[PDB]
Design a protein around this ligand. Structure first.
Ligand SMILES: Cc1cc2nc3c(=O)[nH]c(=O)nc-3n(C[C@H](O)[C@H](O)[C@H](O)COP(=O)(O)OP(=O)(O)OC[C@H]3O[C@@H](n4cnc5c(N)ncnc54)[C@H](O)[C@@H]3O)c2cc1C
Ligand SMILES: Cc1cc2nc3c(=O)[nH]c(=O)nc-3n(C[C@H](O)[C@H](O)[C@H](O)COP(=O)(O)OP(=O)(O)OC[C@H]3O[C@@H](n4cnc5c(N)ncnc54)[C@H](O)[C@@H]3O)c2cc1C
Lengths: 464, 464
């Protein structure tokens, strides 16, 4: 039936952006989405959570630091309003997507898509109808879905980020499976609102993907916040009894029964790869059930690309958009530039203090065989940190002794997730610590912490 | 009979930092300071003021968005406590300075220095003594002082940043002369604490040194705050009546009276150049009554350098430090790098929303015959901005069409002062919009605004 130069499956951060880039390159484009315009990110992930995170932060300040700031008076916080605001922000962002589609003359198709042929797509319109769509190129951005603990299932008390982020009421207590960004974030929010929070992690450290120093620090903050985190603990089963939930866990042989009114499943996310004829299109998967892809987001099938979480490279919004652009451009044959080693891409957990990082960890760089060089500067020695009321955290940078090329960056502190830009730019365009050390940073700011690390990397730090 | 390889006048940011770099380079160093160790910045400038801006920010967040965040109850902010914190933060930084002086084996000389020769310094010790010190090199970092309005004088109710920032009690009202960073910052603090603030600016724009777009925006914010700003108005005279101060001003060829309990004078700062025998050393001044220097902070006298506000290039703390390094490095004969066109150096106003900028403004870049290219991006289209509860402001970039080289950056919004690093690094190391547009930014962050501008600079944006 209808035909288009390019058709994207999914309107998440990766899908709607790849669609825009395709449109900007003069390519007839259409996007197929049945539910979430803006994907999980805008509707029930990035956007809404960051809103709640901010609310939780203020509850923290006007509580634990009220006296330190000369604040008096009895004050209370209604999570309901927090919830409502988060939904409003999301709602506004979603509206933006539809605007962008209209502005770029991108055709929207409201329904579920299924590959019938290598260049045909059968769509189940949300109105009940059904239309066939031919395409010379296709971009799969179907995202991913939360992976539950083997043997367990979702119920009224055992939920995923989705059902939890849409709850206007909070439980008296909760048990979170997974100490990843998403798990830590909910822990921060919930705890700040009076919910007893226990976080269980199979690996030996919270935020295991991060550098060991970062994990150790963020664990200090959470324990200080009142959150109970259990590492090297394995979740055996989750039994929802109605009045409460019993999660059996094991650690070094000993097994105990943890009970809470609710349990959030967040151990990981597995790409959505089944149910829409990926096999009929010819697209192959990986040993990890992820869509195989090359440096150009291209799949085993030439005209079919896979971007976003569906390829499991780095399940993060900005990555999905980045791959989307690389997908569209390469399709149009226009100038593009592969992202390269996806480990060099930035990431951040938005609890307070923030956790931001990129590249390899100290240990990682070592095992890799590089001539590792490390510099670490505490925020207790930063003026801005003291002025804002959060002197915690630090900036740890990793480079190679040869010419001083950055290998990675690991930060923890007040909104440090904004300090990554300079680092990645330098690593991507080969700017050594020597050049970084000659860049003047405004005073007084958190960024100065980076400047000192640049100095400690090259020669000696000044204000330390 | 004491002699040193290098002698530093003034212990402000540039001073003590210069002394530090010198020591690190194995140079016998001594620093002369009679009053403020850490200079105006750590004692009554940067440091203390930033802390006060943080308290004011929290007062603004509550009084205006308390319900928007679901905060219920009535609280009170005690400025006296805010004041006490600012002093603690300050004394902490000062104490740190002495630490670095000892750590680097730098000799502290407590007293006022006066030149007698090009290699001899007479010192009026604070203990009443009077000794002399010789040197092979000298670094003049005597900072600046408040330039009063012609014909006016200081008094009990007519003060400068020093008396103001050091007062624990607040006035019922105040008139601030000068809409520069310092003036605007004080307005914000005082207003948020219940004071009736009126700011008078000779020029037709607040923050006239910034880009017109930024000035307009910041002017709108302050109006909503309740701050009265009179631009294109000249202060004719200030009469301290004891129980009331009268400020005669002229706007539209018509003189009129403005009255308040106090009046802050902050129209500008003049480099400290007299009273310490600069002529005895034979150091020349510019037509602006500032110590002349070359790209290496070198004065007309070969072994005499001047850094900081004293040279009036760019009166800021990071600038002073950066110049100190170049100075000390040049003396020691170590590899260095000139800062270059000081106009490209970053600056920021720490009121909320912040104001951050660097390089040329749009109009300046045009007047200088550049093939100007601009890219603006609003924060209302930024996910993080909504999450934080302040989508106001924007990011304006200006570049040259030749190769997409950056000429200037002008931002306004939530703590945007932390977003300059990437921009100045690129401008300093010939990275263009094209390389900048290929740098992925963590989502969702304020820095994503930069990323959009980069795109709209190389061609077309994405989320707008
Ligand atoms: C609570 C939470 C917080 C997060 N916080 C962050 C953060 O701070 N930063 C960050 O970078 N990432 C964050 N993430 C992750 C981020 O949301 C994902 O990385 C991102 O959404 C992936 O984008 P995507 O476009 O690949 O897919 P998704 O956004 O998952 O979108 C896929 C879309 O495709 C549609 N679809 C699927 N199959 C079909 C089909 N067959 N036909 C038609 N449509 C289909 C779906 O309905 C869906 O809307 C967070 C996630 C969660 C759950
Ligand atoms: C209220 C206020 C807020 C500010 N906020 C900021 C901000 O947020 N960010 C920013 O970057 N800048 C800010 N500034 C500006 C910043 O403080 C100055 O740019 C910086 O202090 C200049 O450093 P300096 O070393 O040149 O001189 P100063 O710090 O002024 O120090 C000069 C020192 O020299 C000493 N001295 C003078 N003559 C002699 C002599 N003959 N012998 C011995 N010692 C002598 C003095 O006693 C003094 O301590 C602010 C300034 C004020 C007033």
């Amino acid at each position: 039936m209808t035909h288009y130069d390019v058709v994207v499956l999914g309107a998440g951060p990766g899908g709607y952006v790849a669609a825009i880039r395709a449109a900007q390159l003069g390519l007839s484009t259409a996007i197929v989405e049945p539910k979430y315009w803006g994907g999980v990110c805008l509707n029930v992930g990035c956007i809404p959570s960051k809103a709640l995170l901010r609310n939780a932060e203020l509850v923290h300040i006007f509580t634990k630091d009220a006296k330190a700031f000369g604040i008096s008076g009895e004050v209370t916080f209604d999570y309901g309003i927090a919830y409502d605001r988060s939904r409003k922000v999301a709602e506004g962002r979603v509206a933006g997507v539809h605007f962008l589609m209209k502005k770029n003359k991108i055709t929207e198709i409201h329904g579920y898509g299924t590959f019938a042929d290598a260049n045909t797509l059968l769509v189940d319109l949300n109105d009940g109808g059904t239309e066939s769509v031919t395409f010379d190129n296709a971009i799969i951005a179907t995202g991913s879905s939360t992976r539950l603990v083997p043997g367990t299932s979702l119920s009224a008390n055992v939920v995923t980020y989705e059902e939890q982020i849409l709850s206007r009421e909070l439980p008296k207590s909760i048990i979170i499976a997974g100490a990843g960004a998403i798990g830590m974030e909910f822990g921060y929010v919930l705890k700040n609102y009076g919910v007893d929070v226990t976080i269980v992690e199979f690996l030996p450290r919270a935020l295991p993907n991060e550098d060991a120093d970062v994990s150790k620090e963020i664990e200090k903050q959470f324990k200080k916040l009142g959150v109970t985190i259990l590492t090297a603990t394995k979740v055996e089963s989750i039994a929802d009894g109605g009045s409460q939930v019993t999660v059996t866990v094991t650690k070094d042989g000993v097994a105990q029964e943890l009970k809470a009114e609710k349990v959030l499943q967040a151990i990981g996310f597995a790409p959505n790869v089944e149910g829409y004829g990926l096999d009929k299109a010819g697209v192959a998967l990986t040993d990890r059930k992820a869509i195989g892809v090359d440096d150009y987001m291209r799949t085993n099938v030439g005209h079919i690309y896979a971007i976003g979480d569906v390829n499991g490279l780095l399940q993060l919004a900005h990555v999905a958009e980045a791959q989307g652009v690389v997908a569209a451009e390469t399709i149009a044959g226009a100038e593009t530039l592969t992202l390269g080693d996806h480990r060099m891409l930035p990431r951040a957990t938005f609890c307070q203090p923030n956790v931001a990082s990129f590249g390899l960890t100290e240990q990682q760089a070592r095992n890799e065989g590089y001539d590792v060089v490390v510099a670490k500067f505490p925020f207790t020695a930063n003026a801005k940190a003291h002025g804002v009321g959060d002197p915690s955290g630090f900036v740890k940078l990793v480079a190679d002794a040869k010419h001083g090329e950055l290998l990675g960056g690991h930060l923890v502190g007040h909104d440090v997730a904004e300090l990554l830009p300079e680092l990645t730019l330098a690593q991507r365009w080969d700017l050594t610590a020597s050049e970084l050390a000659r860049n003047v940073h405004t005073h007084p700011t958190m960024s100065e912490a980076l400047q000192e690390c640049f100095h400690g990397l090259v020669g000696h730090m000044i204000n330390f």
